[PDB]
Amino acid sequence: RIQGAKVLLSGLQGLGAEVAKNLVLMGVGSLTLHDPHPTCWSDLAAQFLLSEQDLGRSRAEASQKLLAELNGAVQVSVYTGDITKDLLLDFQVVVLTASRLEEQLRVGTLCHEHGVCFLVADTRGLVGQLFCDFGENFTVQDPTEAEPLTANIQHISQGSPGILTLRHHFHTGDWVTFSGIEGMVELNGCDPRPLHVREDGTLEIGDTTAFSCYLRGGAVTEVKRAKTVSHEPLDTALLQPRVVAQSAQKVRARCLHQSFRALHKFQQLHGRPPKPWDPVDAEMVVDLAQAMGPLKEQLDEALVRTVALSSAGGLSPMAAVLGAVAAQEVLKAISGKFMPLDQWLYFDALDCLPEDGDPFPNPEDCAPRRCRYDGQTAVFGTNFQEKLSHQHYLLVGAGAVGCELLKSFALMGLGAGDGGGVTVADMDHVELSNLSRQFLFRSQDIHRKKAEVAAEATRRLNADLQVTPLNLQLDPTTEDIFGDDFFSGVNGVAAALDTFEARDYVAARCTHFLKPLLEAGTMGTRGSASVFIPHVTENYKAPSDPVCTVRYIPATTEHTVQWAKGEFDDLFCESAKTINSHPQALSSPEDLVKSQKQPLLQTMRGVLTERPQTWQDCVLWAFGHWQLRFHYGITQLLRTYPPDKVPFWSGPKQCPQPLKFDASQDMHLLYVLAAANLYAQMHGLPGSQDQTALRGLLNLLPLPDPQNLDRIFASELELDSPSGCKQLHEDLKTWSKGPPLKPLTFNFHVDFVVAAASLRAQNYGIPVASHAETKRIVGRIIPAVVTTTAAVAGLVGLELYKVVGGPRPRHAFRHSYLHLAENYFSRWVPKAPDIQKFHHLKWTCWDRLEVPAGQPERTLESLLAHIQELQGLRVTMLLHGSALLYSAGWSEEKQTQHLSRRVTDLVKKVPGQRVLVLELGYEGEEDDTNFPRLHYKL
Amino acid sequence: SILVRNDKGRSSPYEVQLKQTVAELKQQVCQKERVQADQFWLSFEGRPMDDEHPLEEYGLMKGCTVFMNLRLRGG
Amino acid sequence: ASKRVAKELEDLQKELPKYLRNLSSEEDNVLVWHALLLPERPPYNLKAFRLSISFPREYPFQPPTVKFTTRIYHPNVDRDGRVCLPIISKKNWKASTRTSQVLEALNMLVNQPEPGQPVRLELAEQLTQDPELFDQMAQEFTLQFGVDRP
Ligand SMILES: Nc1ncnc2c1ncn2[C@@H]1O[C@H](COP(=O)(O)O)[C@@H](O)[C@H]1O
């Protein structure tokens, strides 16, 4: 759908570069750039598309090639003329960046009159302004991020407004549709019906008097209705800004709005932007701001003055955040999804500035110096750049967020100078799925290391900084490289991990080494950026089904998907390895009894006893296993647990039904096709995709009945006895010859699990997972969006500005959570670490006790006495991670034996280790109390 | 009585007292939205809400709104 | 998390329940426990069963796994020794519960099979339809492979 929309983009500063990068990466089929202004040094600090080589050349013309290389399926073009009405009418969305206010109004009036979606994005130092204008009537079709919540019906009542019984949440006035309805065959795909909610949990769907009796099954899904959005033109929105913000931040955003209006007045009246940190220009901007009067409350003149002073810069993180938001709004306009911004969005990042009592940068400190960082030193100064060049940062994860962080680092100049650098650590290779979700990879980079490619690309963005690629992950198994000597030079850690567990480990290491940890995470259009500074803020807190139920009663979609995945795993990956690993089980049943491998081998042997010869012979095995799993097993379950079992199939549980084979049906045919192809590819037989020939073979030679499988398939009661394993070996005597079976690591991989999940879901009445949902659940692929990635990386870079800025109060740092699908953006001050109190002891999540071993290493009793006199509590327990060095619950002899030994004689001496982290428990400890770790120093 | 906006974008009503702690509201959200506690947190007017603190210290007015925010796996 | 596991191992070793014997860790890994469960049901009491309790790195929040090293003929124990105990289920395991309660539930599961929670469905059907043959085969299997009573 997005391919049909053409986007105009005027202004190719770093913000325009971010917008263009996001739009090209998502795959908007057509984009036109417009920025005739020659490249200046003030742009190289934020424009990753431009280098010092293209000075004087137009920004758009030089950046067109770099945009085209990001996505070859996007028509990136340049328009060298003026933005007239004729040019404007050829685009559906027009974005203005780096455009003066009169041009913004002239373009916006035409866009509002002629139905063109209009976006303004601009960043002035640490302040960002975004304006949307999507017309008087814009229809938004999917105002919700998530898919509609499907549910299944237990009973249907007819007559007066019908009572619905369900196996989910609903609201009055909602419209729902029905699928897979038996009995009421006319309700399949019918027009949506209004819904009502009762206090007892049942729902009403209005008049259903003429519809027939409910049979079984049935699924109900609400339809996401469209909504009308009206936006006022920029000519009037300047006087009544409908800025999205919390009740607390409305006034601050309003003051930033007035500050931008005053800056535009300054540009009109003086013809140049304010000189960097010039008090005279700031005072003139303030005077202009106070001259406008209240918006249709007192104005903050200090805020206006700070904005005026800092406005003379262009920052990479600000560009990333605001361009990510603007690109998401562009995509909302193009595809009609989600809710657009009401009218305005103002992003305040002035927290990155030095404190009130600290010296602010001088007017001549921020003067341009003909360097890459003229757009950065214009707000932060030159000494800030010198200290940035000295920073050596560990970036963990070279993924999408990691690559956007690397872009930000190269633009910032982090590690440009001596002693500074970046270390990028990632083990994963560049899969094809990693392209088009990030700009740092191309076709020639496939299956090469992410860290190395990212290092080369970051070197190309800026040759100054030393990006060192390490192809090892960061976990307990890699302590030898990321040890104390590594972190001695590391000033901080930036985390773009794919899992909560890796985040927990890196946060623990950051707490151990007292390194500021910036943490970036995404899911869909939701993103968070956190900063954890030692002794200032809190530590990172990470969040945390059995075959017991999955094997015989799957209650949820996840249960059926896991069952299908395990079936694939043991039919195509595990049992083949079991066969190939040891031929002893294939030559001696006495060892076969001990090995405990009968059922997988029996089900791999199949209904057949001989090795399959051709495709038309191997195809029998697939539907034989289909009959075994989906008919015989459920028949056994039903006969063991009758429908009136003492009933058992009550409440959430319902009586299942066996599946009857029919080649004409899509699901059974797909299951047979996928299973047969997987078996053939394992066995070395040639696979085939001729569905017509396969169905002809299916209906030419079908099984007579499914009950006779008793003569071929042995029960669980019997396969564990010699009588079963003997005949199993007799059947398998021919299976030990020939080449070994090839395991098929998870081509028909997806088709098999999809068919199995659909069959199981229709069997047990749970909702049927779609192709995308099944792929997400079974492959654990993360729903990710490039815009959230860029915004989160920009927020992390903004926190990095304050981390490099030396000591800061807790009120300076911000944690940020953003949800673009509903215009949510919150930056809050993180809390101080919680004070844990235990009698006279007080400690936080960072504290520790440091004790030297000594030139002669002290005994364990000496250590315990030292800690007891230091703290005031007797050590009742001492461990090294998981090995118990000492406990007072021990008998006297064991206590004395362990007390006489040295610590290093009780724990394994890790090579190169200088600090041992020991875990302590004191007398009278309340349960689960986490006492400070002892950093026993050698 | 307040509204809690869940991950799926639906505002669900809950009944809670001023002196009632954020922990009880969080567990009610857990049982109603079928989501584990450690995987989400609550916010009022942008300010995050801690479980140990009560509702009185966060100024939840009558019929106000609270947002759930999921902890993000990564990218 | 290891310190809590050590405290639990201490409060269990200092006073073992009568149905447990020989509780010990690997002396460098307290997160794994080895024990000899002593059944009391007439079929199972003839032998003692080796048992391993594994505590995850996330133990206070993630339930431990109980596994029979000595193969047992039981409806509620999988053929690899996995025990489908309800208390250690991810659905209702709560941080306030302790391994003593887990071993109480395990003892009651071994001494009082509930066939309504199948793991080996054929064994459950055998138990419900011809419990005498279930008892015969279970006694034969436990006597065939079982640790001597300590
Ligand atoms: N413990 C770890 N150490 C280093 N890199 C990791 C670790 N865990 C995940 N990653 C990588 O971080 C990246 C995060 O994925 P994504 O952000 O989706 O691109 C992937 O390339 C992972 O391979």
Neighboring chain B residues of A784 at a CB cutoff of 8 Å: 75
CATH 3.40.50.150 for domain C2-144, yes or no, is: no
Establish whether residue A450 lines the binding site of ligand 1, counting it when its CB lies within 6 angstroms of any ligand atom.
Answer: yes
**Which one-letter DSSP state was computed for residue A573?**
I
Asked if residue B75 belongs to a domain, the reply is no
In this complex, do A640 and C124 lie within 8 Å of one another by their Cβ atoms? Answer: yes
The domain A555-765 belongs to what CATH superfamily? Ubiquitin-activating enzyme E1, SCCH domain (1.10.10.2660)
Q: Which residues of C115-132 are buried (b: 16+ CB within 10 A; e: fewer)?
A: bebbbbbbbbbbbeeeee
Is A698 within 8 Å of A663 (Cβ atoms)?
Answer: yes
Which amino acid is present at A117? C
Rounded Cα distance between B46 and A349, Å, is: 16
Establish whether residue A452 lines the binding site of ligand 1, counting it when its CB lies within 6 angstroms of any ligand atom.
Answer: no
Size of interface A-B (CB pairs under 8 A): 87
Chain A closest CA to B24's CA: distance in Å?
Answer: 19
Phi-psi category of A924—alpha, beta or left, where left has phi over 0 and alpha has psi -120 to 50? left
**Which one-letter DSSP state was computed for residue A275?**
P
Q: Which residues contact A802 (CB under 8 A, 6 or more apart)?
A: A351, A352, A531, A808, A812, A813
**Domain residues for B16?**
2-70
Is A401 within 8 Å of A789 (Cβ atoms)?
Answer: yes
| 3-state helix vs strand vs coil in chain A, percent to 5 | 40, 15, 40
Domains of chain B: total: 1
Helix or strand or coil: residue B12? strand
In terms of DSSP bridges, do strands A421-425 and A467-470 run parallel, antiparallel, or are they unpaired? parallel
In this complex, do A169 and B45 lie within 8 Å of one another by their Cβ atoms? Answer: no
The continuous run of DSSP H or E covering C102 comes out as helix C99-111
Nearest alpha carbon to residue A120 among A270, A312, A264: A264
Query: Virtual CA dihedral for A682, A685, A686, A688, nearest 10 degrees?
Result: -70
As given in the structure block, the two tokens for residue A291 are 């001259």
Rounded Cα distance between A242 and A231, Å, is: 10
- CB contact A247 to B (< 8 Å): yes
Among B8, B67, B75, beta carbon nearest to A521? B75
As given in the structure block, the two tokens for residue A714 are 């042995």
Rounded Cα distance between C46 and C39, Å, is: 8
Helix or strand or coil: residue A784? strand
Rounded Cα distance between A438 and A320, Å, is: 13
What phi and psi values does residue A346 have, to the nearest 5 degrees?
Answer: -115, 125
Establish whether residue B72 lines the binding site of ligand 1, counting it when its CB lies within 6 angstroms of any ligand atom.
Answer: no
Helix or strand or coil: residue A305? helix
Rounded Cα distance between A59 and C80, Å, is: 66
Neighboring chain C residues of A884 at a CB cutoff of 8 Å: 2, 6, 25, 27, 30
As given in the structure block, the two tokens for residue A349 are 């990042």
Among A248, A400, A822, beta carbon nearest to B75? A400
Establish whether residue A401 lines the binding site of ligand 1, counting it when its CB lies within 6 angstroms of any ligand atom.
Answer: yes
CA distances B57 to A246, A811, B29, B49, B50, Å, are 18, 19, 20, 9, 10
- CB contact C124 to A (< 8 Å): yes
The total of other beta-carbon atoms located within 10 Å of residue B42's CB is: 19
**Which one-letter DSSP state was computed for residue C16?**
-
Q: Which residues contact A221 (CB under 8 A, 6 or more apart)?
A: A148, A149, A150, A151, A176, A177, A178, A179
Which amino acid is present at A422? V
Establish whether residue A732 lines the binding site of ligand 1, counting it when its CB lies within 6 angstroms of any ligand atom.
Answer: no
Which amino acid is present at A652? P
**Dihedral angle sign, alpha carbons of residues A803, A806, A808, A812:** negative
Rounded Cα distance between A473 and A478, Å, is: 7
Is A488 within 8 Å of A919 (Cβ atoms)?
Answer: no
Between helices A250-270 and A279-291, what is the axis angle to 10°? 110
Q: Hey, which of A423, A427, A449, A528 would you mutate to test ligand 1's pocket, going by the most ligand atoms within 8 Å of its Cβ?
A: A427
Q: What angle do CA A331, A336, A341 make, to 5 degrees?
A: 70
Helix or strand or coil: residue B28? helix
Q: What spatial distance separates the first Cα and last Cα of chain B, rounded to whole Å?
A: 36
Number of H helices, E strands in chain C: 4, 4
Rounded Cα distance between A812 and A876, Å, is: 41
Is A13 within 8 Å of A47 (Cβ atoms)?
Answer: yes
Rounded Cα distance between A176 and A148, Å, is: 10
The continuous run of DSSP H or E covering C82 comes out as none
Nearest alpha carbon to residue A530 among B41, C32, C23: B41
Listed as own residue / partner, the contacts of A911-918 with beta carbons closer than 8 Å and 24 or more positions apart are A911/A480, A912/A480, A912/A483, A912/A484, A912/A485, A913/A483, A913/A484, A913/A938, A914/A484, A914/A938, A915/A484, A916/A880, A917/A512, A917/A880, A917/A881, A918/A878, A918/A879, A918/A880, A918/A885
Rounded Cα distance between A204 and A160, Å, is: 9
Rounded Cα distance between A109 and A118, Å, is: 9
In terms of DSSP bridges, do strands A875-880 and A915-922 run parallel, antiparallel, or are they unpaired? antiparallel
Rounded Cα distance between C18 and C37, Å, is: 9
- CATH architecture classification, A151-223: Beta Barrel (2.40)
Query: Virtual CA dihedral for A815, A820, A825, A827, nearest 10 degrees?
Result: 10
Neighboring chain B residues of A324 at a CB cutoff of 8 Å: none
Rounded Cα distance between C61 and A504, Å, is: 14
Which chains, if any, share at least 3 CB pairs under 8 A with chain A? B, C
Which amino acid is present at A629? R
For an interface test with C, which of A477, A600, A882, A906 has the most C Cβ atoms less than 10 Å from its Cβ? A882
Closest chain A residue to C75, measured at CA: A548
The total of other beta-carbon atoms located within 10 Å of residue C35's CB is: 23
Size of interface A-C (CB pairs under 8 A): 76
Neighboring chain A residues of C125 at a CB cutoff of 8 Å: 636, 640
The total of other beta-carbon atoms located within 10 Å of residue A727's CB is: 16
If you compute the radius of gyration of chain B from its CA atoms, what whole number of angstroms results? 12
Rounded Cα distance between A199 and A202, Å, is: 7
Nearest alpha carbon to residue A101 among A231, A290, A257, A243: A257
CATH number assigned to the domain with residue range A836-937, chosen from the 4 options 3.30.365.10, 3.50.50.60, 3.20.20.140, 3.10.290.60: 3.10.290.60
The total of other beta-carbon atoms located within 10 Å of residue A895's CB is: 16
Q: What angle do CA A760, A765, A769 make, to 5 degrees?
A: 60
A325 by Cβ neighbours in 10 Å (0-12 / 13-18 / 19+) ranks as buried
**A725 classed as catalytic:** no
Rounded Cα distance between A550 and A561, Å, is: 10
Nearest alpha carbon to residue A308 among A345, A268, A267: A267
As given in the structure block, the two tokens for residue A140 are 């938004």
Q: What is the DSSP string of A788-855?
A: HHHHHHHHHHHHHHHHHT-S--TTT--EEEEEGGGTEEEEEPPPPPP-EEETTEEE-SS-EEEEE-TT
Atom of ligand 1 nearest to the CA of A399: 19
Between positions 2 and 61 of B, the ones with CB within 8 A of A are 7-10, 12, 36, 38-39, 43, 45-48, 50
Helix or strand or coil: residue A922? strand
Q: What angle do CA A718, A721, A727 make, to 5 degrees?
A: 80
A31 by Cβ neighbours in 10 Å (0-12 / 13-18 / 19+) ranks as buried
As given in the structure block, the two tokens for residue A479 are 């302590």
In this complex, do C117 and A548 lie within 8 Å of one another by their Cβ atoms? Answer: yes
Q: What spatial distance separates the first Cα and last Cα of chain A, rounded to whole Å?
A: 64
Rounded Cα distance between A262 and A306, Å, is: 13
Among B46, B50, B72, beta carbon nearest to A528? B72
Q: Which residues of A240-278 are buried (b: 16+ CB within 10 A; e: fewer)?
A: ebebbbbeebeebbbbbbbbbbbbbbbeeeeeebbbbbb
As given in the structure block, the two tokens for residue A311 are 């406005």
The total of other beta-carbon atoms located within 10 Å of residue A398's CB is: 32
Neighboring chain A residues of C7 at a CB cutoff of 8 Å: 877, 921, 927
Among C6, C31, C79, beta carbon nearest to A887? C6
Q: What spatial distance separates the first Cα and last Cα of chain C, rounded to whole Å?
A: 32
Which residues of A carry a binding-site annotation for AMP? 400, 426, 437, 450, 474
Nearest alpha carbon to residue A808 among A359, A351, A408: A351
**Which one-letter DSSP state was computed for residue A861?**
H
Longest C-alpha distance within chain C, in Å?
A: 47
**Which one-letter DSSP state was computed for residue A768?**
P
Is A676 within 8 Å of A617 (Cβ atoms)?
Answer: no
Domain with CATH 2.40.30.180 in chain A: 151-223
Is C144 within 8 Å of C73 (Cβ atoms)?
Answer: no
Q: What is the DSSP string of A235-258?
A: HHHTTS--B---TTTHHHHHHHHH
In this complex, do A884 and C30 lie within 8 Å of one another by their Cβ atoms? Answer: yes
Among B9, B48, B73, beta carbon nearest to A828? B48
Q: What is the DSSP string of A323-348?
A: HHHHHHHHHHHHH-BSPPPSSEEEEE
Rounded Cα distance between B75 and A525, Å, is: 11
Helix or strand or coil: residue B49? strand
Neighboring chain C residues of A877 at a CB cutoff of 8 Å: 3, 6-7
Put the strands of the sheet holding A517-523 in their side by side order.
A467-470, A421-425, A392-396, A492-495, A517-523, A526-532, A815-819, A824-828
- CATH architecture classification, A2-140+230-348: 3-Layer(aba) Sandwich (3.40)
CATH number at residue B52: 3.10.20.90
CA distances A589 to A433, A581, A599, Å, are 47, 16, 14
Establish whether residue A507 lines the binding site of ligand 1, counting it when its CB lies within 6 angstroms of any ligand atom.
Answer: no
d(CA A500, ligand 1 centre) in Å: 11
Q: Hey, which of A423, A426, A503, A780 would you mutate to test ligand 1's pocket, going by the most ligand atoms within 8 Å of its Cβ?
A: A426
Q: Which residues contact A723 (CB under 8 A, 6 or more apart)?
A: none
Atom of ligand 1 nearest to the CA of A397: 12
Is A569 within 8 Å of A752 (Cβ atoms)?
Answer: no
Asked if residue B47 belongs to a domain, the reply is yes
What phi and psi values does residue A41 have, to the nearest 5 degrees?
Answer: -65, -25
> What are the residues facing A121 on neighbouring strands?
A130
Helix or strand or coil: residue C18? coil
As given in the structure block, the two tokens for residue A568 are 């694939």
Is A197 within 8 Å of A171 (Cβ atoms)?
Answer: yes
Establish whether residue A496 lines the binding site of ligand 1, counting it when its CB lies within 6 angstroms of any ligand atom.
Answer: yes
Closest-CA residue, ligand 1 atom 18, reads: B75
The total of other beta-carbon atoms located within 10 Å of residue A118's CB is: 25
Establish whether residue A405 lines the binding site of ligand 1, counting it when its CB lies within 6 angstroms of any ligand atom.
Answer: no
Rounded Cα distance between A378 and A289, Å, is: 22
**Which one-letter DSSP state was computed for residue A142?**
B
> What are the residues facing A166 on neighbouring strands?
A153
> What are the residues facing A523 on neighbouring strands?
A526
CATH class of A381-544+782-817: alpha beta
Domain with CATH 3.40.50.720 in chain A: 2-140+230-348, 381-544+782-817
d(CA A917, ligand 1 centre) in Å: 26
Q: Which residues contact C127 (CB under 8 A, 6 or more apart)?
A: C75, C113, C115, C134
The total of other beta-carbon atoms located within 10 Å of residue A368's CB is: 15
Which amino acid is present at A711? R
Rounded Cα distance between A595 and A465, Å, is: 58
Q: What is the structure's resolution, reported in angstroms to one decimal?
A: 3.0
Rounded Cα distance between B19 and B54, Å, is: 6
Is A179 within 8 Å of A152 (Cβ atoms)?
Answer: no
Closest-CA residue, ligand 1 atom 23, reads: A428
Helix or strand or coil: residue A140? strand
As given in the structure block, the two tokens for residue A749 are 């991989």
Query: Virtual CA dihedral for C91, C95, C99, C105, nearest 10 degrees?
Result: -40
Residues of C identified as active-site: 84
In terms of DSSP bridges, do strands A93-96 and A117-124 run parallel, antiparallel, or are they unpaired? parallel
Q: What angle do CA A660, A663, A665 make, to 5 degrees?
A: 80
Rounded Cα distance between A28 and A76, Å, is: 10
Query: Virtual CA dihedral for A695, A696, A700, A702, nearest 10 degrees?
Result: -10
Between helices A771-779 and A749-764, what is the axis angle to 10°? 110
Is A116 within 8 Å of A92 (Cβ atoms)?
Answer: yes
> What are the residues facing A175 on neighbouring strands?
A194
